[PDB]
Ligand binder design. Structure first.
Ligand SMILES: COC(=O)[C@]1(Cc2ccc(O)cc2)OC(=O)C(O)=C1c1ccc(O)cc1
Ligand SMILES: COC(=O)[C@]1(Cc2ccc(O)cc2)OC(=O)C(O)=C1c1ccc(O)cc1
Ligand SMILES: COC(=O)[C@]1(Cc2ccc(O)cc2)OC(=O)C(O)=C1c1ccc(O)cc1
Ligand SMILES: COC(=O)[C@]1(Cc2ccc(O)cc2)OC(=O)C(O)=C1c1ccc(O)cc1
Ligand SMILES: CC(C)=CCC/C(C)=C/CSP(=O)(O)OP(=O)(O)O
Ligand SMILES: CC(C)=CCC/C(C)=C/CSP(=O)(O)OP(=O)(O)O
Ligand SMILES: CC(C)=CCC/C(C)=C/CSP(=O)(O)OP(=O)(O)O
Ligand SMILES: CC(C)=CCC/C(C)=C/CSP(=O)(O)OP(=O)(O)O
Lengths: 385, 385, 381, 381
């Protein structure tokens, strides 16, 4: 009902927006129900999605697909939306790298939401953004669906909408012929919060020392590489800063290396998470792999990253069986016994035992305070067509 | 909650729209609850009001106030919205009679709602609408809040939105120096449905014979007069056509004359409704009075009109006591025992025992098939300020 | 140059609008120059086209630019199908909203634009959603349209006109086209108060009754379009258009003279001219009968020759020859060069789709006139 | 005439936009003519102003048109405070969104517009919602603004500039203005990679340290504005503006020469000119120190004389006298007539608010220049 009511109440300004809603909103409503969001929050979020996200999605120019993800720990499941906002001139001479859509979205969110802060967005836009002529050069040197600089996620947590943004470093790297490592840390080392917070500066210096010998010292795009910077759109002093590595090679040895920061982290917390990540890899027998190093102001110590396993081209029925098995290993019997039925109900129009593109990523995390968590990213449109 | 959730989910494009929502939507949500609309329909209608009605309302140019009305019979209470849509150039040289806002609204409704039909709107717009130069002449000859030709109501019935429009005859009357009676019936006699439906033509001819000697034969604006034409925005063949009289004089004798069509209607149905209307007038000891004659294709017989009692300048605490008394007379004990508490809860920010502008109209009706009904029109903004 | 300056000053809200401008506005600017509109009017009309027409055009009948040529002057006109943002979907299957949106915007821009006739014909020949969906089943997939619009760029103003198709209501109601055409006209406010129009129409009916279908069929000749000016109903020309596939010298005489009703020298001079043009030279032929309130007498129609599928180099040579016959030596000596310059990105000697219609007219007061309709996009791609 | 043609072609989406056009566009057209912009550029810039500036202006600092006069030419510039649709409400208390909306639209219109410096300074001196609400308690009710914008109408292009106020972040953070100004500048990408800019800035700091507050107070002279060009950071002039209430011949010397640091004949020729202008002649005085990447040496500032509350007839006579002193006889003989013609709906001899600022500059390569800022609305109402 909510996704249908809102469709009857609001209609659509054009057919593209209708088509996006007809191929996403039922799934979104279902995910929200399954995660135990109340009716009022289902309406909150679907209304929000209708007004603010539909027009950002573009036509039904080369972007990553609209992704709904779930963050699962033993207590609860939190839903999140990941998108490439698309400007109305995206991919044309006037906007070759689609540099305006995501800021338009965030500007609109800043007058909607009382706790959204654009300062980190603006900071990183100044540091890794490009002018028109530089965007045109970057399109010549880039695969035709990487013609993007920023993208956006919306965490649907505690009855609020929490935006996050990701800035790609590659385009400025290609155009300026500057090493990715240098332009990443230079952009970070120029933040206001960096200049006033000793713990962040320590955490970063340790991260730099780990990354220096593993990533390129030259201007090449040779993995592993620092390809993305992530921030929360909140007070700079509260915001997690994230450095993402992209790489094509992952075996048990590189997992250990990335997870522990090459032997720096040796505590039982780290090793229990490591065992869990190694087990997951074995369970899957497994786009680049991602590694996400997270830092916060007021914290001098690096914690283990999150590792993202690409799932495109692996059968979704197998992934679902694999995840049930893995939830059993974790002692999450509740999650194991519903996952498969709940997956079928999110995507009723396809048979998951024949698809290979519905599960896209599986991110893994351990914290000592919070616990272990499972992040599953779905290509929503691929589960509705 | 729904009115608040939608405010958090959607925000506002400008301050005027926020201010309208802050002074209407809580009351609207409360009315909808009191009338037993489910949560899902409360969201349906409030979302609708947010997207479609807020931008039509204009700044927080001379129009009638946004009105929420309730239609009460013993079974149920139906909620309705009445508004003057305001175009963005309303009252300026480019649009002196605000001739565009209501059509903009209806165009938007025609792509939203599957059963909305514009043919009657367009027909009456062709017959009583004016060009720019004629609109400017009419502004010279009109009171500065009658600078309007059409207005709109939205019946919120059976989980649907049913639009109705009202066309004022006075402006074309003033500008063309044509009698109001003539231009009203001429416009009606030119309808497609009139040309093909003998019963409507009979019903109308009886109405004409009753109205001819009571309203002006000349071009004057001397009451009683045919001041408004009302239609439903549905298939012309299903649509009720309504002719409204405005007048300043009402005593028991004119009530009898209007109610029975000067002795034409003499059945017990008509006389029971008459007794009820006479009692209501006595109970109130009572803007013009309105009389609304309703016709439908396939019906050759006129039924008694609805009579509208203006309540502006009478104390709202007295009206509420008066209505409780009157609901008792009718044997509607349920409605009598809640009316006063429910009224206070619709308008918590004012003390109704001191206001005089919250109740605006009280319309009365009797049908033999449906039953007696009570129509109460509230100035929503006056109950929130 | 104006079309380039306005591009630099205004930009585009989206790529479709840019593309329409990049394939139409240079030509439009050139037509305006060739017709001797001043620089200020070139800017007036191109700025107008940018703000009001671009968004009506939809994603990138075809946008038509036409020229009305008599010996004194050449007047430029734009003919379009406005496209609503939900056109062709379940919510708007016959694109019934775009043209009214355009006209509402014009009613606040222009002091003399009147929507009463638009609204009257919309009420009479328009359809509701469910009837629009039935009509889409029974119609070719590019005739999913009810109204279109023209903008006459005359005397430094913009004069709108609208055209209502009768075919959809015909198919849905299974009513003869002749009956619904005249029924819609006979219901006008102006018809009820103007005897001369009623007479003129009764004579047109008497001529059309035995020539068009008495049944519900869509066979030619047929009353397929009603045209009105968006001005005071009492000043507005009402036009009834016939569409037909058969035209020979005998049918020309029949249509031109209303089957022998018109016999004056005015009529016969125009007849000789129209016969010659035919000799000099697949969409139907069009015949357009024009009536005005206060006029009881029918005049000869305008006849539209379809030119789609005929080579544009041949049409140009044919037109030069014909302008010579008329004693318009000036128009004959420039036509070919001016045509090349309107459409520089294409070779007009290779194309078959640039010239679309050639309408012809005679008046005794004004004179003979030539109306050339160009598919602008086909001369630019 | 262009401003009238564009009005007829484009109309207005709402009355506020009409009103702004009816009180600004005639003047803007007249200024452009007087400065010898061709008809095509008059249309370029008025069409631009219609589409992009009107909706930014809000409901009907004040919209300023300025002229930069040297002996060769006069260049026209527009200075505005863009106004967001929720400006001044709880959702946007310091109007922090309008100017970025305007610049985003300019970035797709114009090929050379760059937002990196805009974004950098927005991150450094901008505030979140709760901090914007605190600043509104501590600020006069028309200083509820953080950024404003100018558009230089030079060489047939539009060159945007932005100005960030430091005062709000100052009040909210209780940080000295001097510290936050330089901290924001010292964090630029270009500062970290350009030694000459760092040197130029260090010399400016050394001059400003003992003259402006060391505490958090808002007392003069103070660093109140940072100005940047919206172009490649490496080409962009960075400007630090002082606002002060006290100016005599001694402080002029002090500001002009950087307290004796600059002693060359270029500096002293400009100094004589600025002294004369002062003799010839309540908002503060402005002093604008300009730096560029690749330049290690500070040049003399531009000094802005406030003219609000002084009679405009007297200012005009004062300017004629001063153009004579400069040997600009042409500019002296037309100034007064050209001023009357810019503002025909008002009598400029009765007004005190039309001329707002008079900025003065010397370069050795270019020459002396005169910048006159007009409150356009005050010359039209
Ligand atoms: C801009 O980031 C992307 O588009 C991602 C992740 C990514 C990021 C960098 C890179 O070199 C390769 C992949 O590539 C994807 O296919 C994808 O789905 C990504 C992603 C997914 C979810 C999300 O919230 C952000 C990015
Ligand atoms: C256009 O109609 C109005 O504005 C009404 C009713 C009316 C109508 C005609 C007239 O000469 C005097 C009053 O005047 C009112 O004050 C008012 O509230 C009217 C009304 C109210 C509700 C509604 O749904 C339609 C009209
Ligand atoms: C709805 O009318 C059209 O689309 C026209 C003319 C037409 C009109 C009726 C008909 O039965 C068949 C064709 O068909 C065309 O191909 C075309 O170019 C038409 C036209 C052109 C210009 C104009 O102002 C109106 C219609
Ligand atoms: C925020 O800056 C302004 O609004 C200005 C200049 C100013 C700047 C800083 C300050 O502390 C006091 C005044 O104050 C004015 O009255 C005015 O007209 C200013 C101005 C004018 C044009 C321009 O391009 C920028 C600022
Ligand atoms: C291949 C690379 C480097 C990254 C792509 C992986 C991906 C889906 C990144 C977004 S991670 P995010 O949704 O923001 O998750 P949290 O870090 O807050 O748990
Ligand atoms: C003074 C005059 C003539 C009329 C004003 C009275 C008024 C409030 C008219 C709208 S009546 P309406 O809401 O459409 O009620 P229904 O007839 O369907 O019951
Ligand atoms: C009806 C058929 C088959 C073709 C006619 C083509 C057509 C509608 C041309 C426009 S006629 P129009 O431009 O409105 O010209 P005028 O009658 O005012 O001279
Ligand atoms: C800072 C004070 C008090 C007044 C200055 C008034 C002001 C900001 C004028 C604009 S300076 P601007 O137009 O940007 O001119 P240029 O420096 O490029 O010559």
């Amino acid at each position: 009902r909510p996704w249908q009511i809102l469709s009857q109440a609001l209609g659509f300004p054009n057919y593209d927006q209708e088509l996006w809603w007809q191929n996403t909103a039922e799934t979104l409503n279902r995910v929200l129900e399954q995660c135990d969001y109340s009716v009022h929050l289902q309406y909150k979020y679907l209304a929000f999605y209708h007004k603010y996200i539909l027009p950002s999605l573009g036509p039904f120019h080369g972007g990553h697909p609209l992704e709904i993800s779930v963050k699962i720990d033993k207590s609860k499941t939190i839903c999140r939306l990941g998108l490439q906002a698309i400007g109305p001139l995206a991919g044309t001479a006037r906007d070759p790298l689609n540099s305006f859509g995501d800021r338009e979205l965030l500007k609109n969110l800043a007058t909607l939401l009382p706790h959204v802060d654009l300062r980190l967005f603006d900071h990183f836009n100044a540091q890794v953004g490009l002018d028109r002529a530089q965007c045109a050069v970057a399109t010549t040197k880039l695969i035709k669906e990487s013609h993007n600089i920023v993208c956006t996620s919306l965490d649907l947590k505690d009855g609020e909408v929490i935006p996050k943004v990701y800035f790609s470093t590659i385009p400025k790297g290609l155009v300026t012929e500057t090493p990715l490592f240098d332009l990443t840390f230079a952009a970070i080392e120029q933040m206001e919060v960096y200049h006033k917070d000793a713990p962040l500066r320590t955490a970063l210096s340790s991260l730099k020392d780990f990354l220096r010998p593993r990533v390129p010292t030259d201007a090449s795009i040779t993995p592993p590489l620092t390809g993305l910077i992530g921030v929360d759109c909140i007070d700079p002093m509260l915001s997690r800063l994230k450095v993402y590595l992209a790489t094509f090679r992952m075996d048990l040895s590189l997992i250990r290396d990335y997870w522990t920061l090459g032997g720096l982290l040796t505590d039982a917390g780290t090793m229990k998470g490591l065992e869990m990540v190694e087990t997951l890899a074995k369970t899957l027998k497994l786009l680049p792999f991602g590694i996400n190093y997270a830092m916060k102001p007021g914290t001098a110590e690096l914690a283990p990253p999150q590792i993202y396993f690409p799932l495109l081209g692996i059968n979704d029925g197998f992934i679902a069986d694999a995840l049930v098995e893995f939830f059993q290993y974790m002692g999450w019997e509740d999650q194991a016994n519903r996952y498969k039925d709940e997956l079928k109900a999110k995507f009723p129009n396809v048979d998951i035992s024949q698809t290979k593109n519905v599960h896209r990523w599986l991110g893994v995390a351990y914290s000592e305070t919070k616990g272990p968590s499972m992040n599953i990213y779905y290509d929503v449109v691929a589960g509705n067509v």
